[PDB]
Amino acid sequence: LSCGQRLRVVGGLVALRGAHPYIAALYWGHSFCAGSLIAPCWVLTAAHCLQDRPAPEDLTVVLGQERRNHSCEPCQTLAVRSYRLHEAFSPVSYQHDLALLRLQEDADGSCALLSPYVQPVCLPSLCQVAGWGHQFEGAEEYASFLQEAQVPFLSLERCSAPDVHGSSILPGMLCAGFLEGGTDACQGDSGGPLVCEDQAAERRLTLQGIISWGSGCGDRNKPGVYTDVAYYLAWIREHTV
Numbered sequence: 754l755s756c757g758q759r760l761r762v763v764g765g766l767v768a769l770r771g772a773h774p775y776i777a778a779l780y781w782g783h784s785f786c787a788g789s790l791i792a793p794c795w796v797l798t799a800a801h802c803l804q805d806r807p808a809p810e811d812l813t814v815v816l817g818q819e820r821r822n823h824s825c826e827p828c829q830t831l832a833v834r835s836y837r838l839h840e841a842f843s844p845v846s847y848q849h850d851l852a853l854l855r856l857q858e859d860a861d862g863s864c865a866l867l868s869p870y871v872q873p874v875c876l877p878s879l880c881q882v883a884g885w886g887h888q889f890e891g892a893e894e895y896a897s898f899l900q901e902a903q904v905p906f907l908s909l910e911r912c913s914a915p916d917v918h919g920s921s922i923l924p925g926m927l928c929a930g931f932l933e934g935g936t937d938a939c940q941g942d943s944g945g946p947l948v949c950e951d952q953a954a955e956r957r958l959t960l961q962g963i964i965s966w967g968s969g970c971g972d973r974n975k976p977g978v979y980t981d982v983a984y985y986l987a988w989i990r991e992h993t994v
């Protein structure tokens with residue numbers, strides 16, 4: 754498939770190489786964030802990851818990772834040429850929590866080299882959250898292997914209820930998970946994906962959300978809040994030329 758091809762977090766299971774070929778790991782200093790390769794030179798992440806404005810030259814993007822800590826011969830390490838946070842991102846409400854990383858092209862104009870293990874994810878036009886974050890709130894360490902968990906969408910009516918997130922859910926956000934708790938994104942999953950298999954398009958992986966924020970991890974009535982990628986389609990297309 755041109756995009757969304759697939760080869761093979763609290764309450765998740767290990768996601769081996771090729772399960773999320775689009776997932777990107779972003780490193781700088783002692784900080785980390787996840788992202789999604791949406792085109793060979795473009796990675797979509799959360800704006801809150803880059804609030805402190807690290808210099809692009811200090812960033813490293815790694816594609817093809819299974820364990821974050823291992824050196825991996827087929828994995829692709831790329832420099833970041835520049836990045837763009839959404840101009841409306843608010844560090845107080847977390848509205849408009851999205852950012853684009855423009856990967857550094859080589860002498861031949863190439864960034865990510867596509868393979869069975871590295872493939873872009875489709876943009877919108879069943880659902881899982883993935884990441885290397887804490888496997889429970891307060892965990893001393895990030896997960897060693899990439900984790901994946903199946904989480905369903907929650908309507909704006911149910912997520913904006915007073916016992917759930919109330920008035921905190923603003924336009925551009927969506928919720929996914931369970932009101933029962935137990936399965937969700939957690940600290941360290943920032944910027945990562947919420948991908949769905951598009952039944953209408955041969956089950957191709959489609960990026961529906963960006964892991965943004967949560968009140969706890971897997972708590973009852975507190976599902977994870979994601980940036981609604983479909984809400985920003987024109988912004989993404991406008992800034993990825």
Ligand SMILES: C[C@H]1N=C(N2CCN(C(=O)[C@@H](CC3CCCCC3)NC3CCCCC3)[C@H](C(=O)NCc3cccs3)C2)O[C@H]1c1ccccc1
Pocket residue numbers: 784785786801802803844845846847890938939940941942943964965966967968969970977978
């Ligand atoms: C270091 C990393 N910590 C964070 N953040 C600390 C706050 N946060 C939350 O959701 C806040 C709420 C927000 C609401 C809006 C206003 C600000 C508080 N609550 C969490 C609950 C779980 C424990 C941590 C706090 C963000 C987050 O974890 N997002 C991922 C998640 C998705 C679902 C559940 S946690 C960002 O991001 C990373 C990072 C930052 C900077 C550079 C690189 C990485």
